């Protein structure tokens, strides 16, 4: 079971399954090595990105009805910039 580590700008370490991190085109490119440092993505944004990775893998091509991916207004802008940079 392959895992990768994603480090935020504030030094938080996020350990996710490799296959889940490959959701991001940027991450997949950086792994083309199992540790990626994001000097401009804070931990409150990176944790939310990792939750999207789980959501995407679990619900893409599912038969169980799909719930909404919730985003608080306070994180919306930073989350948009990270999704744009990460190509996910």
């Amino acid at each position: 079971m392959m895992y990768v580590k994603l480090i935020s700008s504030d030094g938080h370490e996020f350990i996710v399954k490799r296959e889940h991190a490959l959701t991001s085109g940027t991450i997949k490119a950086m792994l083309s090595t199992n540790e990626v440092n994001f000097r401009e993505i804070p931990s409150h944004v990176l944790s939310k990105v990792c939750m999207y990775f789980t959501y995407k893998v679990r619900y893409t091509n599912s038969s169980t009805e799909i719930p909404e991916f919730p985003i608080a207004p306070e994180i919306a802008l930073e989350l948009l910039m990270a999704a744009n940079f990460l190509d996910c």
Partner: protein
Amino acid sequence: RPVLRSVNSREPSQVIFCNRSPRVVLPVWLNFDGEPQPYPTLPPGTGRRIHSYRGHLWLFRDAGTHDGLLVNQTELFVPSLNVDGQPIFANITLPVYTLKERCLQVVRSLVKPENYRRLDIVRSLYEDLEDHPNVQKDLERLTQERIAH
């Protein structure tokens, strides 16, 4: 006559529209010229038994934002003829949006189009925010895919 349109079959078909999404759903019918027709909306978690015809083409959107929705895990719904009375089921759900698209939906729901360029974000994102979900763009995208296959 375009690629994506309804055929004037005159062959009756009973359909069940079931909104299994947290959104107010706009059923869209493509007419005999492939032009999109808005139909009465469905509140979240409601179902209606409706009358349609064989070879008629349907799309489903969020009634307020026109964000694209799925029906039986695909984009287009075409009822065939009922086999021995049996109505055809159309299960409407949320697709798995990209993180970018979902973030764009949320920021569009909170900010007025005039204030998009007042946001402290990467400048490329202004054109992304301005490029609102459009039924016509998606129909071109789906037509291009149909001709490709």
